[model samples]
Target chain A: SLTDAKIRTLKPSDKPFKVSDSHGLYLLVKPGGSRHWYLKYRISGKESRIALGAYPAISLSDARQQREGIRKMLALN
Target chain B: SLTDAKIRTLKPSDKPFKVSDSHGLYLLVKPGGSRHWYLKYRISGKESRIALGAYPAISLSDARQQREGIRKMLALN
Candidate 1:
């Protein structure tokens, strides 16, 4: 349920913060005002994080699409 | 041109080593005998690397497929 409006309003904090977008997709805001896109997944019972891209350049829709691509890969496995 | 046999034969040294697959997808062999899969890509002209997964658990074919997924996503952008 993450919207572009909410994402654009997000500000950097003293520490890095993460905003979940459901189904393992999330946005990480660093203290340095950098917002990165990440996706969490499990492989062989081990959790792994994949970097989608940075925010602004990689919009919410783009991150979701990347997550969907990863989901399909996981499903096949 | 990387194969499972070649991957298994990779030995760890004092320094980390990388075995390239293609299109910036490669296997990183750490000094601690850890084999990590990584993909390099560009976003807004800034280069970035994404961790795919660990070796053996994430097979060569799996890594290739994952790379393909990311490639398609990149193409859309």
Candidate 2:
């Protein structure tokens, strides 16, 4: 479970890295130390993506809620 | 100078350490990973101190404001 505290503690590396959340949601850490929320999903045997927004702004809890939003929205398709 | 981001990154050490702010205010980081704000001032012929409160609760800017409160209050004494 990624927390706001943990997210704040996440440091940047030489390249972008991922700290994933449950159900394909992850925090992308850029080389310059920026963080963004992204979600990965499968659509018709192809991969799809969603940008939830930026860190601190998006927050861990809100990103989790958005993950549920994607799951429910995809079920009807 | 400290920000919420820097405060979050401060790790616990073997013992308590001080991260001082401008003026007499400082953040006391305990070995157990707790942070407290404190201030050091002169009381006539001796050293005096004040506990500003906990970090994140008090915030950097709020603590700085409180430092001014102490200085003005002391001058009147």
Candidate 3:
């Protein structure tokens, strides 16, 4: 549940928070408003995330494309 | 010749200008300060450039890596 404007409106607070997107995709916002994209994946029932890149630079569409790439990689292997 | 700091220092003027790096790699700074990375390659005795991506999102190191990938692709084909 995120849009480009929604992401742009997000500002930093005390601790880091995540703006969840589609399946396993989220944007992590840090104290300095350093927003980074990440895709959550599970290995052996544990949670893990792969950093895509920073936002505005890595747009929402780009993040989705990267998520698809990882999905294919996981499925093929 | 361009460095990371030099790239940051580049400001757009009346017209677009290219900041050459090495091995035919350059950064094209367009009006409104929108910067993009590109790699030069010759095909059919004509010079052409390939768009890598926008700068800051695509760093100097990343651009070099992308250029290497293109080099290998060209070699393997």
Candidate 4:
């Protein structure tokens, strides 16, 4: 499980990486020290990712809500 | 009402401005031509805004859903 404190305490590494929060939600940390929330999903056989927003800007709960909304949208179509 | 086409067709002006959507939701168009979605709301007498994300990446519908989610969170607290 992902917690706000954990996210806030995350440090940027030499190489960009991601911290998974489940349900295809994860935070991508760039080499430039920018952390962004992203959602990985497959729609109609096409796999892609969507940028939720930057960290501190988009909180953990907010990212979960956005992921749920995307799930509903995918289910609808 | 702001349609996706209208949002896409919006041109950058000499001065930065915002285009309202609904329920205090709007897009802030910067002088640099970067458009970002924002949700304005008052919680406990203090007014603040949340950045939903940048246009194209976040999309119009995505911004609305994010706004709705934030509303729910505010209502819960």
Candidate 5:
């Protein structure tokens, strides 16, 4: 649900939260305090799933580059 | 210090550990359990720093793309 927002350190907690959501892209927060990146898109005229990165480490800029790179790959592949 | 290894999920503890490193690229563990990615490399014969991704979300594949893309960008710019 975040867009152009600075990611702050999450307080120590056991709750799960979605860190960010930008349409086809989302960062999921697991119960065990881990975050996973997902990209919802289509490839080869079929729906495909792509794992981008894990969180806190995968910054916003890097994520953008990844998304674009994958899109290009899918288009050219 | 990890290379081609399935990233393991760290447990909840008060201990610090690095996530990965493959020459010129390493992940740093902060005291507060946050991990940061750093690329130890040279650009134009000058030390250049690049933050790749955060962790858990910054999956291995994505990290590779990031490293490659940045390297290409640096070469052109």
Candidate 6:
């Protein structure tokens, strides 16, 4: 699960993963070798995350566009 | 919105819709003029479907690839 994975802040065990700062996209890898894609952001008054499907199933460009759409939707809401 | 519009079987008012045989994608137009896209297919043991987002949000080529992905996912599931 994402909660168990290294996230947000840098940790000793967390060697920095390469996620683009230009676009709000990143990967989450657990010690078990399970990987997931996440679009990092906040909604309402609290910080939250949205799960884009597993990697390779959803391409990077598509993830970027999906991030763009959620940004728009949250803005509307 | 889609429920009020004409669908599936051709009617006198329905001048026939153009969905490619290879891609099973089609549009739904209700009496109030609302439109939705449907990727016709079956899932599990029943005829189940997923609603792709509104028009112009998901483009045609993207729709085809999404359909392809779903087919693969379902085959595995």
lDDT of each: 0.82, 0.74, 0.76, 0.79, 0.59, 0.49
> What is candidate 4's CAPRI-style docking category based on DockQ?
incorrect
Task: Please tell me which model should have the higher TM-score, number 3 or number 4.
Answer: 4
What ordering of candidates by DockQ runs from best to worst?
Answer: 4, 5, 1, 6, 3, 2
For candidate 6, the docking band is incorrect
Error of 5 at A69 (Å): 0.8
* A1-77 per-residue lDDT for model 3 (tens digits): 78999998989989999999887889999998799988787767888676777887878877765565455334422
Native-referenced DockQ of model 4: 0.09
Off by over 4 Å in 2: B1-77
Candidate 1 lDDT over residue span A36-77, tens digit each: 988888868998687888888877876775675577545635
Give, for candidate 4 chain A, the lowest lDDT window spanning 10 residues. A68-77
Q: Chain B TM-score per candidate, please.
A: 0.94, 0.86, 0.88, 0.90, 0.60, 0.56
Candidate 2 chain B weakest lDDT stretch, 10 residues: B68-77
Candidate 4 positional error at A11, Å: 41
In order, the interface RMSDs are 7.8, 20.4, 8.8, 9.1, 7.6, 7.1
Better of 2 and 6 by DockQ: 6
**C-alpha RMSD between model 3 and the true structure:** 11.5
**How does the DockQ of candidate 5 come out?**
0.08
Arranged by lDDT, best first: 1, 4, 3, 2, 5, 6
Stretches off by above 4 angstroms in model 4 are: A1-77
Chain B of candidate 6 achieves a TM-score of 0.56
Give the per-residue lDDT digits (tens) of candidate 5, residues A1-77: 55545445543257765555564666767667676666667656787456667765776666766665444433433
Best candidate per lDDT, number? 1
DockQ, all models: 0.08, 0.01, 0.04, 0.09, 0.08, 0.07
The true-versus-predicted C-alpha distance at residue B10 of model 1, in Å, is: 0.9
Best model number under DockQ: 4
Model 6 Cα lDDT, one tens digit per residue, A1-77 = 12222334423244435344244567655544445666666646677555666655665555555554444433434
RMSD of each: 14.7, 18.6, 11.5, 15.2, 15.0, 10.9
Which segments of candidate 3 are over 4 A away from where they belong?
B1-77
Instruction: Give model 5's TM-score for chain A to 2 decimal places.
Output: 0.62
Weakest 10 consecutive residues, lDDT, candidate 5 chain B?
B68-77
DockQ of 1: 0.08
